[PDB]
Design a binder for this molecule. Sequence first.
Ligand SMILES: CCCCCCCCCCCCCCCCCC(=O)OC[C@H](COP(=O)(O)OCCN)OC(=O)CCCCCCCCCCCCCCCCC
Ligand code: SF4
Lengths: 175, 99, 83, 96, 115, 103, 155, 88, 70, 318, 98
Amino acid sequence: MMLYIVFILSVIFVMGFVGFSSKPSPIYGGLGLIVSGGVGCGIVLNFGGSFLGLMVFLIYLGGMMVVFGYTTAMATEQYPEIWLSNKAVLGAFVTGLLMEFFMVYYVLKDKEVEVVFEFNGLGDWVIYDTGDSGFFSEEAMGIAALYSYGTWLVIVTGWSLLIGVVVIMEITRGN
Amino acid sequence: PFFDVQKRLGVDLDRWMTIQSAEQPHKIPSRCHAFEKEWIECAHGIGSIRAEKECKIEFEDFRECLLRQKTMKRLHAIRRQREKLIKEGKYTPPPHHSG
Amino acid sequence: AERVAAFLKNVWAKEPVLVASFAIAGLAVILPTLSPYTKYSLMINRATPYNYPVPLRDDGNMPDVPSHPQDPQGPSLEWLKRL
Amino acid sequence: SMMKWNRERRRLQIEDFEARIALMPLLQAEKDRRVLQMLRENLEEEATVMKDVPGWKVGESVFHTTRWVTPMMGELYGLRASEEVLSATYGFIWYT
Amino acid sequence: MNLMLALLTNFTLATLLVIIAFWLPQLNVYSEKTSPYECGFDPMGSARLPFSMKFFLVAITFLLFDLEIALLLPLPWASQTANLNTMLTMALFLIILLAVSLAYEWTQKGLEWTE
Amino acid sequence: YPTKETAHWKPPPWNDVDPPKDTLVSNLTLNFGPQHPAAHGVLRLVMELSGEMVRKCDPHIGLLHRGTEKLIEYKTYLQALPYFDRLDYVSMMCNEQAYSLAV
Amino acid sequence: RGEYVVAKLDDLINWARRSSLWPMTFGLACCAVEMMHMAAPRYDMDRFGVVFRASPRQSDVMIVAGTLTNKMAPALRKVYDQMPEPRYVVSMGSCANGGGYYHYSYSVVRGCDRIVPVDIYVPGCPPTAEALLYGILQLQKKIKREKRLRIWYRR
Amino acid sequence: SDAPPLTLEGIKDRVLYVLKLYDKIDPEKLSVNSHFMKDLGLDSLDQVEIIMAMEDEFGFEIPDIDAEKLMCPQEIVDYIADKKDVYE
Amino acid sequence: MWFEVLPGIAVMGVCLFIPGMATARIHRFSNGGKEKRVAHYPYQWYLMERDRRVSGVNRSYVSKGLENID
Amino acid sequence: MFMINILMLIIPILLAVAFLTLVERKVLGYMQLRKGPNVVGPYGLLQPIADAIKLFIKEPLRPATSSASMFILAPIMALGLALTMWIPLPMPYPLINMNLGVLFMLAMSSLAVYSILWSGWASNSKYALIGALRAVAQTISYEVTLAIILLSVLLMSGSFTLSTLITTQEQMWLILPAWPLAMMWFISTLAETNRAPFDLTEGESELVSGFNVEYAAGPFALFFMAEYANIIMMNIFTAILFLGTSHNPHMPELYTINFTIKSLLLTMSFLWIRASYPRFRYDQLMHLLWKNFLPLTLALCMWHVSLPILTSGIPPQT
Amino acid sequence: MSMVYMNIMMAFTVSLVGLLMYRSHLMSSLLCLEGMMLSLFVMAALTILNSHFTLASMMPIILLVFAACEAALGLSLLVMVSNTYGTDYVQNLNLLQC
Ligand SMILES: CCCCCCCCCCCCCCCCCC(=O)OC[C@H](COP(=O)(O)OCCN)OC(=O)CCCCCCCCCCCCCCCCC
Ligand code: SF4
C-alpha cells in the first residue's frame, strides 16, 4: 500500500547495503551504494527533509564517480566478479537477504520485534506530528543557522577541509 | 568537558546545540520541549546520582515523548482487539472513521 | 613607485583572469564595511514577521506598547516604504 | 534595477505575512475544536472495542503529568479513512 | 505520488523501446559478429587490465571541493538571518579558505597532470 | 623464541626500506587503425599507452603495399608513367613531373 | 487479400532503409579521395540521407574504395562481419573491383568480392564523384525492390 | 613449518615420475641408468623437451650448455643435487 | 537557400510549444478554470486542505464565498 | 488527467528531438555551403522518420565480452533520466512544482553521468573504456564550477524554486546584472552536455565513436535521443535563468511563445558553435575551468553574497 | 522505535560486518566505510527531523563533510598502496609483524 512507502524504501535501502557489503567487484559495489543512496534520499525526504535528502544523494553521486575512475586503475582484474560468480560473495549475498526477509516477516506479523531494541510494526506514520509549521521549512531554517549560530562549526569544518587538501598532497607525493 | 575553558573564558562554542530546548531560530519549539524543560529543571544542581532517583518521573515522561513506546503499545492492543472483534462480525465501524 | 606599476602591468599581461578575480573579491570584503545601506539590510530581516506576535498582559504600566495594531505606539516601517 | 525590485519584493512579503497573522487566531480556534472532536471520537469508539477487556482503563493517559500533550498522528487518526490518513501524513510532502 | 507516476512512466517508455529493439528485428548471430571492435584487428589483452589515471590527485581534490557546495548552497537561506554581520563574515571566510585550498594545490603543481 | 612458524622470518631492513619490486604493470596496447577516421584507412598504429599518455608509437605500414616498384619492371617507360599518379594521389602532376625529369 | 498488407509494410521498411543509408568511414586509396568529394558541397551526399559514421556497428554500407592487399584483407572482413544486418557493400574503382592496375601483383587481392559479398560495382580509376553517386542511387533502387515480407508470407 | 628437506631419494622419484609422464619413453625399459638417445631412441629435440619438464618440476632455469650433457636420468638427479646442494 | 531551413525549425518549434500549452489548459480544466494551487509551505497546505472541508464536495478549488455565511 | 499531461510532455519532446536532428544537419549544411537533407520528403521533413525506423528494424548485438545486465541498463537509464529533467521546468507552469527544483536538476544531471560510465565499462572494449574515463574526467571539470554558478544566480532569486526565477525577472533579464556568470554558464552547458568543442567522451576523430562504439540499432538510438533531449533541456534552463520571460496569468500562451523562441535561438547557438571551432583536449578542458573559471567563479560568489547586503537588495525567502 | 529504525540499524550492521570481513580488494572495503556513513547520516536525519530539533538540522550536513575527508584520505593511501605493489590486494600488506 502507500502508507508504508517509507518501510518499503527502507527494505530496498538495506538490500543495497547487502549488495556492496558482499564485496563484488567495486564496479558493482559502487552501483549498490548508489541505489541505496537514492532510496536513502527518499526516506529522509518523506520525513520532511528535502534539502538533506537531495544533498546526500548529490554528494554520493560525485563521490562514487571518483571511486569508479579509481576502480579501473587500482581495483580491477581480468574477470570482475558479480554476486553470482563466487560462493563467498553468493553465500554472503543470500545470507543478508534471508536475514532481512525474516525481519520483515516477523515485524509485519508479530508487530513487535525485539533485537537489542524493541521495534514496533504498526507503521511509521503513527509517530508523525499533527500540527503544521509556519510559513517556512523547519529543516531549512536549521541549515541556514549554520552561519548565524554555527560559527565554531564553520571554523573547524573549513580548517579541516583546508588541511585535507594539504594532507593528500603530502601522502600522494611519493618519492 | 575535561578542560572547561568555555566556562572560564565565557564563550559559548557548542552549548547552543546541546539540548533541544535551547533558543532556536524564529522560536521554533521542538516536539518534546515541555518534557525536556521539566527534567532539566528538576535535575539541576542536585547532581547525577540524586537525579537518577529523585527526578525519575520527569525522565520517564521525557523518554515517552521521544520514542512513544508506552503509547504505541496501547494503540497496538486496541488494534489487536478490534481486528479480532471485526473478524467475527461483532464490531460495527463508526460512520466518520470510514464513511 | 616604479616597481608597483611593473608587477601590476606584468600580471595584467599574463594573468588577466586572476586580476579580475582578486579585484572582484576585494570589493566584496571591503564595500560592506563602507556601505551605509548595510544597516538597512539587517533591519529589513528583523522586520519580516515569520512568527506570530504574541500579545502581552496589560499590567497597567506599559505606555510604550500599543493597545491596537493601528496605534501610534510601536515600531513603524515608514523608513521601509520610503526606501 | 535588480536591487529596487528585490527591495519592493521584501515589502510585498511583509504584506503577505501580515495577512497571515491576521488570520492565525481564527485558524488556531478551528484547529483546537477539530482535534478535540477527533480525540473524543477515538475515545468513544475505543469504549466499544475494549468494553470487555478486564485490565483496561478507558481513555487512560500514558504520561505521569496531567499537562496537555499534543497528540501524535497515530492517536488523532486512529481508525479514520485510509485515504484520509495518507493525505494527513504524506499529503503535504507528496503535493507537487 | 505525481512524481512517482512521472518517474515510472519515463523509464517504462524507455524499457519498451529497448524490448522492441531486441524483439522486432530479424537477427543473425555468429562469433565473428559479436567480437570486440578494435579497428579491424584483434585486441591485445583484455579491456579489464588496469588503466592509469594521470589526474588522480585532481580527482581526490574534487571530493573535498564538492563538499563546499553542501556548505555553500544554504547561503540563499542564510542571508535572511537577523545576524548579518556574523553570517556575512563566515560566508566569506568559508569561500576564502576554499580559494586558499585551490591556490595551494595550484602552486604545488597539484593541478598539473602527471606523466 | 624461534618456532616452527617463525623460522623463516627475516630481520627487517636496517633503514626500513624494502627493495622495490620488479616489472608489475604493463602499458595498455591499442590498435589505432586501420579502420579509424584519423588513421587514413591504412595505418595500423600500434600504441602503448599509460592512461592516455603515449609511451611508444609503432606504425605498421604495408596495408597499402601493392608492389609498384616491381610492377614497373614489367612495363615500358611509358606504361609505367601512370603508376606515379597513384603514389601521392593528392599530388598527381607533381609525381609525374619527377618521373619525367628522371627519364 | 492479406498479401497486400504485407506488401505495404515492405514498402515502409524498404523506404526507411534506402532513405537512411549510413556508410562506414572506410577508405583505402586514391578512390577514397573521390569519396570525400561526394561529401563536398557540389554533390552533398548528405542531402540523400547518406551520413558517414566511424563505428562499424553503426553503419549500413561498406564502400570499398581502393586497393585491398593481402595484409589488409583480414581487417576488411572483420569490420564487415561486425556490421549488423541488413548490410550492403559497394565496390568502388578498379582496384576494389578486380585488381585494377595491380591485378598481377603479389600483395593485392584480385577483387574485393573474394573477401565479402558485393552488391554494386562502380567502374573507373577513380570513378568520378558523380559516378559514385550514381552507384549509391542505384543501390537505393536495389533496396526498393526487396520483397522480404512478401517472401515470408508465401513460405 | 620448515618444509621437509630435499633428499637424493626424493629427487629420484621426481625425475622418474616426470619421465614416466612423457609419452615417447616406454615405461617398461626406463631405468635410472638408461640413456635417452641410445637406449630410449629419443632424438635431440625429444631430449630438449624432457629438460624443459624438469625446469617446471623443480622450478629453476637450466642453461643450454648444461642440458647438452644430461643424456640419462642419473645425471639429472646429480644436477638437481648440485643446484640444491643435496649431498645426502 | 537558407530560408529552406525554416520549415524544420517551425516544426521543431511547434513541438516545444505543446508541452507548455497542454499543462496550462489541463491545470485550468482540472481546477475549475483557475491556476493550480501552489503549496510550498505548511501554511499554504493547511489552507488548501481547509478548502476541501469548507467546499463540502472534497474539492479544494470549489470556492465558497459570502453566499455561504449568514 | 495527470497521465494525459505526462504524455503531452514526453511525446512532443521526442518529436522535438527527432526534428532537431534535421535542423542540425540542415543548419550545419548551409554554414558548410551544402544543403543538408532535402530529398527525403519536402525539405527533408521526413528524414527523421526514415532514420528512426531504420534504427529500430536493425539488428542489435550484444558483444561476446559485454556485461549483459549493465550493457542494457545504460540506454534505459540514459533516456529515462533525460525525460525526467523536464518535469520541473516552468513553461510557465511545471508538471511537478518542486520547491527545490534547482537541486533536483543538479542531482539528476549527476546521476545521468553513470549511464555513460556503465555503458563504456559494460562494453568491454578499449575505445569504449577510454571514452568512459573521459566522462569521469569531464565531470570533474565542470561539476563544481556549474554548481557555484547556480548558487551565485540564486542569491538574486531568493530560493531554489524554478518558478521564482520568473518573478525575479519581472522587471529585467538576469543577463544584465550577471552577464559574466552567463558567459561561464553557457560554456558549462556546452561541456556538461558533451558538445563540441567539449564532445570528448564520444570523440569521433579520436575514439571512432567513444563510449558507444559497441552500441547499434535501437540501443544506440536511445543514447542519440538522450543526448539531444539534454541539448534542448539545458538551453531551456539557460533561458529561464538569464532570459526570463514575463508571465501573464490570463494569457499563459504568450509566455510559451516567447519562452520557446528564446529556447530555439539558444539551441541554434549550440549548432552554430559546433560548426565554428576545433575540439579541446580533454586535459585542457579541465585546466580551462579549474584555473580560469574556478578562480573567477569563487570571486563572483563572494561578490553576490555581499552585493545584496551592501545595497539592501536581499530577496524574499518565499 | 518505529519499524523504519530497524532497517537503518540493520543496514549499519551489514556495512559494519562487511568492513570487518575483507575479501581481497582494499577498494571493496573502502565502500563499506562510506556505506556506514550513509547509514549514520540517515539515522541522524530521521531522529533530528522527527523531533523538530531545529538547530540539530545542521548536524547531518557536517557529518558528510568528514565522511568525505576519510574517503579522500582512504583513496590517497590506496594510490600509495598500488604504486608499491601494482594492486590494492590486502595480502600484500604483510611486512609488519611478519
Ligand atoms: C580581511 C581578510 C581579507 C584578506 C584575505 C587574506 C587571504 C588572501 C589570499 C586568499 C586567496 C588565496 C591566494 C593566496 C596566494 C596568492 C597567490 C600566490 O600565491 O601566487 C604565488 C605565485 C607563484 O607563482 P610563480 O611560479 O612564482 O609565477 C610567478 C613568478 N613570480 O607567485 C607570485 O607571483 C606572488 C605574487 C604576489 C601575490 C599577491 C596576491 C595579492 C592578493 C590580494 C590582492 C587584493 C588587491 C585587489 C583588491 C583590492 C580592491 C580592488
Ligand atoms: S581504382 Fe584507381 S583511384 Fe581507386 S585505388 Fe585503384 S588506382 Fe587508385
